[PDB]
Design a protein around this ligand. Sequence first.
Ligand SMILES: O=C[C@H](O)[C@@H](O)[C@H](O)[C@H](O)C(=O)O
Ligand SMILES: O=C[C@H](O)[C@@H](O)[C@H](O)[C@H](O)C(=O)O
Ligand SMILES: O=C[C@H](O)[C@@H](O)[C@H](O)[C@H](O)C(=O)O
Ligand SMILES: [Cl-]
Ligand SMILES: [Zn+2]
Ligand SMILES: [Zn+2]
Ligand SMILES: [Zn+2]
Lengths: 413, 413, 413
Amino acid sequence: SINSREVLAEKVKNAVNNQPVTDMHTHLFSPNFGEILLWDIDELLTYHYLVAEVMRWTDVSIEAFWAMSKREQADLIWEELFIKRSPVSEACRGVLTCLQGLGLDPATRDLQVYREYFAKKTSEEQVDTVLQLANVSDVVMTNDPFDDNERISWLEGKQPDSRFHAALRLDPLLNEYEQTKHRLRDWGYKVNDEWNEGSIQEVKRFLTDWIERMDPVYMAVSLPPTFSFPEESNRGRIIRDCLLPVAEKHNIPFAMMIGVKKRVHPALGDAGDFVGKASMDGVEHLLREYPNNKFLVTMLSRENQHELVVLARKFSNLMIFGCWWFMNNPEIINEMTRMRMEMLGTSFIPQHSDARVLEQLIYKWHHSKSIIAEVLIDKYDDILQAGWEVTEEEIKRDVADLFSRNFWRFVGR
Amino acid sequence: SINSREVLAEKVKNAVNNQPVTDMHTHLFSPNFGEILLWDIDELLTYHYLVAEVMRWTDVSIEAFWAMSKREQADLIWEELFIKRSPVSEACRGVLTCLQGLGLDPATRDLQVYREYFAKKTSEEQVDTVLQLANVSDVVMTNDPFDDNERISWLEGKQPDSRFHAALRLDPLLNEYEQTKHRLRDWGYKVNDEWNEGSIQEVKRFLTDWIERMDPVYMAVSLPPTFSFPEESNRGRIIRDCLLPVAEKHNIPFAMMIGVKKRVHPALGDAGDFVGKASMDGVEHLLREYPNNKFLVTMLSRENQHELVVLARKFSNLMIFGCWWFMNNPEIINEMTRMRMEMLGTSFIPQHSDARVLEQLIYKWHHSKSIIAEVLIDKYDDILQAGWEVTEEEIKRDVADLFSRNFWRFVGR
Amino acid sequence: SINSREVLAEKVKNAVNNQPVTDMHTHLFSPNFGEILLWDIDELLTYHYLVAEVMRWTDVSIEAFWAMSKREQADLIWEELFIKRSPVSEACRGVLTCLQGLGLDPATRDLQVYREYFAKKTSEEQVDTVLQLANVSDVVMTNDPFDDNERISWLEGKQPDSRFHAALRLDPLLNEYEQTKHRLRDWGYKVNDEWNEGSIQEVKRFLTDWIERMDPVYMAVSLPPTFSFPEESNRGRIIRDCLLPVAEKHNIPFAMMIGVKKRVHPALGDAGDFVGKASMDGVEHLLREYPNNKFLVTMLSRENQHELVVLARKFSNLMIFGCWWFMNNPEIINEMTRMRMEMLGTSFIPQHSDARVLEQLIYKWHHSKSIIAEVLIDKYDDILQAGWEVTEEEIKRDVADLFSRNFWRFVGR
Ligand SMILES: O=C[C@H](O)[C@@H](O)[C@H](O)[C@H](O)C(=O)O
Ligand SMILES: O=C[C@H](O)[C@@H](O)[C@H](O)[C@H](O)C(=O)O
Ligand SMILES: O=C[C@H](O)[C@@H](O)[C@H](O)[C@H](O)C(=O)O
Ligand SMILES: [Cl-]
Ligand SMILES: [Zn+2]
Ligand SMILES: [Zn+2]
Ligand SMILES: [Zn+2]
């Protein structure tokens, strides 16, 4: 038996730390895909989270910033966010956690010595190291066929190694059909000006072709705060007539990441997206009217979090996951995870890294696991208090569900 | 349930704070004995501990000090030890704890106002107040029949109320028999020039008459660092032929307070006593050779404390008690209480107040309980972390033993 | 009027760190006295404390040690105590604190670079640097007229600058009179074979001559555990008939450092002295029988510390000081300072450095001040809890007393 919270805490932390992670959403790529996989300290420092933060302090114009080299941008951000002010933000703290995890010494602030660590290694070797340090067993990528570069890799016959899984990302198709439909035809998809049977069949054929090629764990899309469904728009029709029917046939979940208001500040590039609270109506309708379809949902607005949890209590075909983007901060991760566990027990996926740079797997999982561990400790302590006898083996089981099994069980893999 | 140091701390502190205390050695007297019972702020300030301390600072002569009135003495000490220097010593801190405990605010340093509180109250009322505030149920006195003022009270029928118990103090008889024997014969006890049957029987008769009149919980004596037993001396023969036989007969324990070197500085009066390490040979012999006699022991030298604990491990008829006088300081109370618990568990009496002024019951027990609580928390947490179940009921039981039951169980009442 | 614990700790540590220190016992000398003033890393590393410690490790014989040069000894000690084993002992920790305080960096472990720092400075410059860093305003030397080198200097005019003060050390006179009276005769002091009026006056004359030449703040002597008084020995007679009367006439305190057992291991030189517990009988008699004399006392045995504190409670003509030699270790300094403040408030002198090497003032005072601040904080906090509120001015007053005013007020200078 575990007769003290102090021992419980030790056992929970060990279980959480030792549990291999299935990161169901990132922007990483299998090493064999090439340069598309970003990594190293200069990439860490130029993460768009830090671009947005440095612009709040630096007097260097954004145009000038984009004009300088990768190394130069990294030097500015380091100096502005780490030296001129203490690197206390979550994103800056993350950079330090990565350095320490790699065996480097943040206390020296010797950026050139840090850069030297990476220069003497290959992509293949760094992924081996990072996956080991972050104890991540499986990585789900974001695979967009509309991106020429990435698309070439799939066209070439490249296959991700066993540690990487594909996810068919469809923002262009579902959100910019009017402009995208012209590319589909360039590829042999006979989509017509009007939405008839021929257009529907060709879109599905498109979806089906890529599903066969990537063997994705799910199809995904990021939607605006004004997302609605049903809706008489290209998106509404594509989802109704093509995506859902196909998703059902192949029994693959549809991942919806709702809440993002793209480019409210275009000059900032990837760092220029905002957020807004969304209506739950469309998700409510999708879940109810399509019981044979599986939905993975994460929302961007803090104000959408609690009702999303309640919606999960209503529908079993809904699997909520992670603390996305602006939600990926300790104060928010903590409240989200507690609301979720209190109303759903362990039937949810608490987190994903959303890593854009390989090394971030270290900090994203380190910072998140410690928070998740604290929550589990409280919840286990409360039932131990109620006389329940939790075993270390049950704790390991629960932890496996949260960090890995719940995802594979839901996707059916 | 109690499953963390944090929960444990709360329960222990609560149980300790709520446990009614039996103070087994004090210099307080049941209120009906008259002015011999000292109380109020001026008495607190003139406690001999503060007399010793003020003389290290004041340019006022010790002879001039004794010549001043009580209020003048109090004003000087207050001025010298509280105003001219921060009152950080244990005895000065204690005065402050009493004031606060009575609802008076030390923040104001308004001595005239503190005094008004006492003036509008009687001895009987202050006793009620203090016993309630210090949560002391029983007070054991020090009753010296050789003191003319004390002896007349007992002979004239004075008897303590239920909250006060007597202890027959015998220092003059055991340590000054050559002078004291003449007083015994003046009182009708035919002690002879030589230690013969007649002398032995009359001394026994003296002890029996006083036991019947006082119904003492024990007979006591303070002894010098040079104490020895067996010993061919008046003390050695009185203890062997008179005290031990009488104590066994009435099943009354014999309390020995060892290590005091009386009057090394005569001019300081009650404040002129020093300390010295004693040999354990005498105590060891008494315990081994008189298995049917009970011994309460407390020693004055810091260097005697560890071996006294080991001696208790050897003899069940030895019950050690308190952190006496110069031992009654936080640093020492802590080490003594920990060594005691580690080697004796709960089979000892951790403390007594030795209160000379009524209000001291407040600070003596509050200062001690906080330290004793901390020790218990450490000790209970060590076994809790080891897998042991500690219930709030077992804590109250143990705390009751330490602060009350152990004493009464030992005295046989 | 501080009411929060965080602010209290802040002000206390500030007062302690800002308070200019009077180091009332050292083995340092005014820089103008010449080579006699030891300084630099080589001196710090060869301090006899480290000699004793390296011998427990190194296979190099003591004779070989003494045979090698100073720089060679320093190299062995550095290697044996800092490189082969972590420098965790108090003495080794001290060397490090010194190097760091001077702006040097222990992280590099570059002994040669450290040495270069000292090579570019003069003795007068380093004392300026060290006295400023250790914030020491007054240094009391140990001046022995029996040492040829030192004696010639006092005779050849030499005078210390205003920052250094003299203390007349009399070990040879009080402890080796039989062999010393012959030198007294060589100096014009015709002591008689027997102890009579002539001998008494010539010894007095000797003391008075040196008192006028050195103008010492006190006369001192280190005594063995067997020290007794009164005593029919040269030491007993000299102290009774010469030292005390002269000390009183000049109102000069008599400093006794009791407990050292000289040269139990002669081959270790200054590192060959041992320790033993002393009887308090002689000190008690001195204080009681000579109320017009002032005594400064420090003892070497851990086991004498508590009773010495109690003796201070008895006699105001006793001022206890420092944590001497084998007592100058954190664990002991802590228990000693707490026992003292608990029974004496602020009426004592907590520490002295005993510096034999100039730079030691940095570590000696940095290590002790942090401990004394801790004790003060706890004690101030305890009365704060009782409702008493101190002002920042009273704290500075108290701190000044402990680190400087108590000493000067006691010697009457
Ligand atoms: O966490 C933030 C991501 O890096 C975003 O830039 C990204 O666009 C978003 O996670 C998405 O997949 O739509
Ligand atoms: O604790 C100190 C007491 O007040 C002493 O003055 C007293 O003589 C001693 O406790 C005793 O009862 O012998
Ligand atoms: O603290 C230790 C000193 O360095 C001793 O060697 C010295 O003899 C002693 O302090 C003394 O002055 O008697
Ligand atoms: Cl809202
Ligand atoms: Zn993403
Ligand atoms: Zn007493
Ligand atoms: Zn010294």
